[PDB]
Ligand SMILES: NC(=[NH2+])NCCC[C@H](N)C(=O)O
Ligand SMILES: NC(=[NH2+])NCCC[C@H](N)C(=O)O
Ligand SMILES: [Cl-]
Ligand SMILES: [Cl-]
Ligand SMILES: [Cl-]
Ligand SMILES: [Cl-]
């Protein structure tokens with residue numbers, strides 16, 4: 001599944017991400033756009049043998065277990081494969097733990113580089129949520 005912008009905004013609002021840890025909904029939609037292009041199935045391999053999974057590109061070194069990553073911690077207590085569902089529940093629950101862990105949304109490099117600093121409210125504009 002690839003989400004549309006307003007469809008994803010709607011789903012993330014349903015899951016309680018609007019203002020989660022102080023981050024307005026547009027932050028989360030922008031993060032998904034530049035992390036995964038709204039693609040629930042996307043994966044990306046890294047040089048440290050970890051992999052980024054799903055719509056928020058959650059990484060296997062710290063957050064989920066994929067049975068193939070060195071120095072893994074599985075802080076979200078979830079198999080990485082669960083983050084490749086077309087249903088965003090597991091990714092949101094993991095994201096809430098990541099953003100609460102103490103560095104906010106800076107955890108997402110694409111967000112830090114291509115969303116932070118811009119007017120993120122524009123990502124939910126016209127969605128009439
Ligand atoms: N700023 C924009 N309008 N971006 C395009 C997003 C449109 C989105 N995929 C939708 O149908 O809701
Ligand atoms: N992604 C960045 N580093 N942006 C820096 C400047 C962004 C600019 N203030 C804006 O409204 O979008
Ligand atoms: Cl895509
Ligand atoms: Cl897995
Ligand atoms: Cl592993
Ligand atoms: Cl969903």
Ligand SMILES: [Cl-]
Nearest residue numbers: 089090093094
């Ligand atoms: Cl979950």
Ligand SMILES: [Cl-]
Nearest residue numbers: 109110111113
């Ligand atoms: Cl980036």
Ligand SMILES: [Cl-]
Nearest residue numbers: 024025026121
């Ligand atoms: Cl917003």
Ligand SMILES: [Cl-]
Nearest residue numbers: 018025124129
């Ligand atoms: Cl809203």
